[PDB]
Design a protein around this ligand. Sequence first.
Ligand SMILES: [Zn+2]
Length: 258
Amino acid sequence: HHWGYGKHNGPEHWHKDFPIAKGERQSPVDIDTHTAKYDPSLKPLSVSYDQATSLRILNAGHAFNVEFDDSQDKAVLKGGPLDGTYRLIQFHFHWGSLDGQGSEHTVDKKKYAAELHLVHWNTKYGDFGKAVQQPDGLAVLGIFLKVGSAKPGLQKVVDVLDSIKTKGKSADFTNFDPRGLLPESLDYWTYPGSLTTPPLLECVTWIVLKEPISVSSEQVLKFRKLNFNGEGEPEELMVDNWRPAQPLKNRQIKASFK
Ligand SMILES: [Zn+2]
């Protein structure tokens, strides 16, 4: 039936409806730190989120998304391996049922408790829909979450989850500053990949940060109380909404640091 993360509709079944699932540049992948190539040509990342305008938080079924106004260059990502300006449209997370799993990308096979994805699209394409049809249409910033000390900047997100427990529910979410979710350092790995959920389009430049952010056990616990199901339906907890690592194939992962 509809795709998901269950036993009968999980990632291993996706290829039946989305053949590209077995493509040449699928994500996520395992980052082998000893095989990554240091590239002195890579520029520092430029994150300009000072004018970011968040609008709403939505339970999309497979995750919850925090949406931003992308009708102007308010919150953009530039530099790094990117050519052009990419506007932030939304961010969401992937997490597990236990602290030992949850992230999509892994580092030397190590899994993190969760993974934050800040999605941006290339403005030269006019809109997000056009952008996903291009090889350099999207730029996704990936940040790992490890369980430890609480992240003050994440609490605002945590407190509103009760209002969007089931699929389809949304709530106004204005004046949220995404800068509170960034680690201290912006050193990264980068490689050409895809969207990790259907339609799995191979239109993404991945920028995965080396430094994880820490969140508290209580904070991640609240993520696990969300439901995949819609109201009035049998409760299915939203956990383990991550896709396992895919073959790197003929791709090279580059590092901005040595
Ligand atoms: Zn994602």
